[PDB]
Amino acid sequence: VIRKFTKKNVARAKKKYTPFSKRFKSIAAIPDLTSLPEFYGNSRFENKLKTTQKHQIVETIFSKVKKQLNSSLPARENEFASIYLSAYSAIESDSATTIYVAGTPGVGKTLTVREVVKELLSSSAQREIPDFLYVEINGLKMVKPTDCYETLWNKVSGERLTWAASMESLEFYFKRVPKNKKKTIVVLLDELDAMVTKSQDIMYNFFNWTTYENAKLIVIAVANTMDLPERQLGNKITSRIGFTRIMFTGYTHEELKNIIDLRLKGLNDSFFYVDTKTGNAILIDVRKVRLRMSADAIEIASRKVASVSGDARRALKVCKRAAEIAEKHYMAKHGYGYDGVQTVHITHVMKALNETLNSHVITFMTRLSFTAKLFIYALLNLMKKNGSQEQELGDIVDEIKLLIEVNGSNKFVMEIAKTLFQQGSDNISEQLRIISWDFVLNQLLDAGILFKQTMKNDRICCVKLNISVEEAKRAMNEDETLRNL
Amino acid sequence: NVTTPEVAFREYQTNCLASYISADPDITPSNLILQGYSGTGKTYTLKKYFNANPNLHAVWLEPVELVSWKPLLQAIARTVQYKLKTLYPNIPTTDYDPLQVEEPFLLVKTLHNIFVQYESLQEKTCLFLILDGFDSLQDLDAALFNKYIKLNELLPKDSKINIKFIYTMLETSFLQRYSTHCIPTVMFPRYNVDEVSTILVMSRCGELMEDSCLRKRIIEEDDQFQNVAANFIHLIVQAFHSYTGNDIFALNDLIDFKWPKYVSRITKENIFEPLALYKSAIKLFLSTDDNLLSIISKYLLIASYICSYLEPRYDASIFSRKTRIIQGRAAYGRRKKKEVNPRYLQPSLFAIERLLAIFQAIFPIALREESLMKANIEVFQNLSELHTLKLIATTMNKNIDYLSPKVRWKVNVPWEIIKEISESVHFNISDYFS
Amino acid sequence: SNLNRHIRMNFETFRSLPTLKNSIIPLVATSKNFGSLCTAIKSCSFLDIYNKNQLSNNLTGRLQSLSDLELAILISAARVALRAKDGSFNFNLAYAEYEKMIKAIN
DNA sequence: TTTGAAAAGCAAGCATAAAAGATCTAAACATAAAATCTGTA
Ligand SMILES: Nc1ncnc2c1ncn2[C@@H]1O[C@H](COP(=O)(O)OP(=O)(O)OP(=O)(O)O)[C@@H](O)[C@H]1O
Ligand SMILES: Nc1ncnc2c1ncn2[C@@H]1O[C@H](COP(=O)(O)OP(=O)(O)OP(=O)(O)O)[C@@H](O)[C@H]1O
Ligand SMILES: [Mg+2]
Ligand SMILES: [Mg+2]
């Protein structure tokens, strides 16, 4: 038969369509799912990425410092206690509950929740509480937002079903199955804002299963914002999530110090056998070298990060960047390759902090050609003349022509007018646009300095500055020629 | 190690093609753009260059025949492996289906799978993918050309087959969208009138040799025949260059239309004197000649034109002709006439009832004779037909309800068409615009 | 030298070495012998020819390919667009301006 | 034969309806691999 179109790349998973409510003949016929081989969880790729080294690589003194500062809990004790007490009471009373946690990035939400469920699993290993199943659902790690329905049911039953069948199965399992035939499930919903669809059915279902009497379900919902339910969710879901919500504040600088010095307990103020032939250092031709990080360097890093964000990732990356700068300076002076006392002091931390804060924008427009800077200068002149923050391109063409023909006594303009309008030939006729007109316009568009409107008339098309006018004039004043006229 | 052909007024372009297109993949750019308008010899020069160098392996595609991006990807995947089959017939391959390519990354994957089975070749080779008319895709956006620019970076670096893209473009603005990519571009400017005349002689004289009309009239009444053909071409150019511009195709059309009638005025007296042949065949060098409703409906169209091009507040000053029992004054009319000629601009919008009032004001005619004409079934059927024939338009074009009082009406005919309509029923519409 | 002048012109306008490479490549390749290449790199006249070709389909070069009727119609439309306040025109007003200009010329 | 005088005409300024279209979505239309359902055997 003749097809109107073809779908030759369809890849369909092997997932059944029959839900759990039809799996048994009656409610009384459902067995103990805890005593089932495939229920409640009762790494095939990790050998793929291995090879032989055939080399002994050099690990300098700063390498152990840089590995100790990677993201891969002295300051989270009240939040740990609250989350642990709520989850513990819900587990050992066979209750269903929702624990809401919100915060800015890198303040330790995921780490605290994972340590809470680790200590809960340790409690259930010694029979202080009934045994439970732990499930992680990250909303940013799903292809489709409905795949969470597929994931949780697969973690509960071992079945592979499609998403509507999975959510029917989960609805039947939480609602109708008796408690004595079930197990407690703790579900971490990480990145909750990613699980928000147009119709909020996933959020309603996940928080409404926690209001079922038989469910034995605990949902730990981790969100960006305290008032995410009030901003983006319905009143029923906001009622079901609750009024009691746990805020993870940004870290103060004493806590960022505590985190960094907890990362630097075993190598800060310690000795190394350095082997100055290669620089490969071994922790206790060969010298005993003390390594230290300055406490005031950690102080200024922690103070800057705690004022700006309180992010632990940012503080660890700042200290790691400082160690990288010190290691680059160290390997420059010896030529150690990769195959006394060395200190990560204040200035490395300051150079690491300022390299994220210095702007390349003014440096970028400084090193442009004459024609691009002439474009920017004419656009600034038109912006101050007619007061508009949006200028027609034909006006910019006429302004460039006017600035060339008015400042015709300038020596640079005398030297460059023939280049700008004839490419210095006297065989090319006089042009209506300058040489490299479309080039510098497209260059300022790729850089994001300019915005242009989608019109096909070139003269009446408008152009806007996407950067600050003060930055543009500061760039234009650095040039010797354009600051004169 | 390449052969430069001789193209009559494209010598720089041919040297540029020789400088950019070679069998060595190391000294050949990944992308090459030929930019010029219609009839500038881009296809002719590229074809002459690839005919002068048969060792260069070229695949020709017309992006106008494919319309969209997905058939273009499938056409590339089809024609590349067909050319590779016909080029190395002893290499065993797998015939991948070109309809498997639905996305650009699928084209990258399919081209990789095709190219990894020609790895037994000796020397690195060039495959030239010529997209003649890239910006002639009916369905074109600004993001499509970026994919073809960066396509070579996703294909394997040390392959024996290295694809090279040659693009042909029409529009200067489309090319200037991509100026920061710094692709080598050869420009084909529009021809001179002298070059157009030379190309027309050298490409149409031999076609005017064996036309059966000329020889049939010589029998029925070789440098001399070339002389009369070239004189006809030069007369066509000198008569219609201001009409055609430097369009080769328009002058080809005019030559093809006017050659047989010019042939039919060649006599034995005319065959040696070209001025007498130009005097006898004169009327086809003066003009180009390149061309090819009921009573109620005509008056409804006339009334719609009147409604669209006259202001409604002057209506009672023109058509009102009935006597009065109650005291009253009609509209005085315009105090001074405007100088804008409103039939130069777009028509105004009017209601149905004003159109009916003006229609029965100007439609032709003891106690029950019913002198005026009411708007019965036939009037509304004719108006509906006029909307069907697109001689009347609305503001709404799709899902338009005729019956809403918020729906307005306008005429869309030119002034000449409504003049022909008004003079077909002997109506004097030009009085109303005086 | 002429090559330094072309480098200076690129530095003032494009400031792009790929742009200069796209002109240097056909200068090298179109030479047929060693002395011709030496004359080409000493004079850089091919760079002038290349620069002329890169602009030949611009607005300036497209106007120089127009016929007299085309130029007259374009001038008439530009007159009508200048007199308009939205810069807009149609075929009828441009033809009116054209016939007025032809009458006042003849 | 006149005659003031009210109906009608014109302009500037501004609030506002309407047109055009940019952007998007639902639904009809279309295909398709895996699961499931008959259905004799
Ligand atoms: N209290 C802490 N003690 C030690 N290390 C910490 C602490 N808080 C955060 N970190 C470090 O910072 C990293 C980021 O923490 P985490 O993943 O928990 O952040 P998060 O609050 O969930 O943020 P995001 O919203 O970006 O997901 C941790 O992996 C850990 O390395
Ligand atoms: N230099 C030339 N010498 C001889 N004949 C020529 C020359 N240039 C063009 N022609 C003739 O005119 C025809 C039109 O040229 P061609 O098809 O190459 O134009 P083009 O620029 O590719 O046009 P388009 O954009 O419409 O495809 C050619 O097929 C050929 O017959
Ligand atoms: Mg997290
Ligand atoms: Mg062509």
Separation CA B110–CA B160 (nearest Å)? 16
Nearest residue to B175 (alpha-carbon basis) of A439, A329, C60, A483: A439
Per-position DSSP letters for chain C, written without gaps between them: -HHHHHHHHHHHHT--HHHHHHHHHHHHHT--SHHHHHHHHHH-HHHHHHHHHHTTTSHHHHHTT--HHHHHHHHHHHHHHHHSSS----HHHHHHHHHHHHHHH-
The two structure tokens encoding residue B225: 């025949």
Does the CB of A21 sit below 7 A from strand D? no
C-beta of A310 in contact with ligand 1 (< 6 A): no
Separation CA A298–CA A293 (nearest Å)? 8
A342, A330 Cβ separation under 8 angstroms: yes
A394, A455 Cβ separation under 8 angstroms: no
Does the CB of B338 sit below 7 A from strand D? no
Chain B neighbours (≥3 Cβ pairs under 8 A) are A, C
Closest nucleotide to B311, Cα to C1': D9
Separation CA B78–CA B70 (nearest Å)? 12
CATH number of residue B74's parent domain: 3.40.50.300
Other Cβ atoms less than 10 A from the Cβ of A36: the count is 13
The two structure tokens encoding residue B84: 């590779």
Phi and psi (nearest 5°) for B144?
-75, -40
A106 is in an annotated binding site: yes
The two structure tokens encoding residue A319: 């200290």
* Residue from the list A371, A425, A439 with its beta carbon closest to the beta carbon of C52: A425
Phi and psi (nearest 5°) for B60?
-105, 130
C78, C88 Cβ separation under 8 angstroms: no
- Method of determination is cryo-EM
Nearest residue to B349 (alpha-carbon basis) of B413, B386, B393: B393
CA distances A110 to A118, A138, A220, B330, Å, are 12, 11, 10, 86
| Among chain A residues 53-92, those with CB within 7 Å of any atom of strand D | none
Q: Is A55 on the interface with B (CB under 8 A)?
A: no
Q: Output b/e per residue, C59-76; b: 16+ Cβ within 10 A.
A: ebbeeebbbeebebbeeb
Does the CB of A16 sit below 7 A from strand D? yes
Amino acid at site B173 = S
Report which ligand 1 atom has the smallest distance to the Cα of A248. 21
Phi and psi (nearest 5°) for A74?
-75, -20
B39, B170 Cβ separation under 8 angstroms: no
B419 is in an annotated binding site: no
| Nearest-neighbour CA in chain C from A429: distance (Å) | 8
Nearest residue to C47 (alpha-carbon basis) of A424, B17, B185, B180: A424
Q: How far is the CA of B199 from the centre of ligand 2 (A)?
A: 9
Mutation pick for ligand 1 pocket among A265, A313, A319, A320 (CB with most ligand atoms within 8 Å): A313
Chain C neighbours (≥3 Cβ pairs under 8 A) are A, B
The two structure tokens encoding residue A45: 């790729």
Beta-sheet pairing, B185-188 with B31-36: parallel
* CA of residue A332 to C1' of nucleotide D41, angstroms: 85
Separation CA B313–CA B301 (nearest Å)? 20
The two structure tokens encoding residue B406: 């918020």
B76, B115 Cβ separation under 8 angstroms: no
Nucleotides of D under 7 A from a protein CB: 7-10, 18-20, 30-37
CA distances A166 to A15, A124, A189, B245, Å, are 10, 28, 17, 71
The strand order across the sheet containing B125-132 reads B57-61, B125-132, B161-169, B31-36, B185-188
Report which ligand 2 atom has the smallest distance to the Cα of B191. 8
Other Cβ atoms less than 10 A from the Cβ of C25: the count is 17
The two structure tokens encoding residue B129: 């993918």
Handedness of CA A207, A210, A215, A221 (dihedral sign): positive
Separation CA B115–CA A447 (nearest Å)? 36
Other Cβ atoms less than 10 A from the Cβ of B89: the count is 7
* CA of residue A33 to C1' of nucleotide D39, angstroms: 35
Q: Is C96 on the interface with B (CB under 8 A)?
A: yes
Q: What is the resolution of this structure in A?
A: 2.7
The two structure tokens encoding residue B38: 């219609």
Chain A neighbours (≥3 Cβ pairs under 8 A) are B, C
Q: Is C5 on the interface with A (CB under 8 A)?
A: yes
Environment class of B17 (CB within 10 Å of its CB; exposed 0-12, middle 13-18, buried 19+): buried
Separation CA A404–CA C12 (nearest Å)? 15
| Nearest-neighbour CA in chain B from C26: distance (Å) | 5
Q: Which long-range contacts (CB under 8 A, 24 or more apart) does A10-18 make?
A: A13/A160, A14/A160, A15/A150, A15/A160, A15/A161, A15/A162, A15/A165, A16/A159, A16/A160, A16/A161, A16/A162, A16/A165, A17/A161, A17/A162, A17/A165, A18/A161, A18/A165
Distance of CA C92 to the CA centre of its chain: 30
Other Cβ atoms less than 10 A from the Cβ of A217: the count is 25
Separation CA B4–CA A469 (nearest Å)? 54
Does the CB of B395 sit below 7 A from strand D? yes
C-beta of A313 in contact with ligand 1 (< 6 A): yes
Expressed as residue numbers, the domain containing B97 is 11-188
Amino acid at site B379 = V
The two structure tokens encoding residue B365: 């005619």
CA distances B41 to B37, B46, B247, Å, are 9, 8, 11
Separation CA B373–CA B375 (nearest Å)? 7
Does the CB of B313 sit below 7 A from strand D? yes
Q: For every residue of chain B, which 3-state class applies, written as one string?
A: CCCCCCCCCCHHHHHHHHHHCCCCHHHCCCEEEEEECCCCCHHHHHHHHHHHCCCCEEEEECCCCCCCHHHHHHHHHHHHHHHHHHHCCCCCCCCCCHHHCCCHHHHHHHHHHHHCCCCCCCCCEEEEEEEECHHHCCCCCCCHHHHHHHHHHCCCCCCCEEEEEEEEECCHHHHHCCHHHCCCEEEECCCCHHHHHHHHHHHHHHHHHCCHHHHHHHHCCCHHHHHHHHHHHHHHHHHHHHHHCCCHHHHHHHHHHHHHHHHCCCCCCCCCCHHHHHHHCCHHHCCCCCCCCCHHHHHHHHHHHHHHHCCHHHHHHCCCCCCCCCCCCCCCCCCCCCCCCHHHCCCCCECHHHHHHHHHHCCCCCCCCCCCCCCCHHHHHHHHHHHHCCCEEECCCCCCCCCCCCCCEEECCCHHHHHHHHHHCCCCCCCCCC
> Of the ligands numbered here, which is closest to the C-alpha atom of B40?
2
Q: Using an 8 Å CB-CB cutoff, list chain C residues near A433.
A: 58-59
Look-up: residue for tokens 């180009």? B288
* CA of residue A38 to C1' of nucleotide D37, angstroms: 27
Mutation pick for ligand 2 pocket among B14, B34, B43 (CB with most ligand atoms within 8 Å): B43
* Residue from the list B177, B178, B180 with its beta carbon closest to the beta carbon of A443: B180
Amino acid at site A256 = L
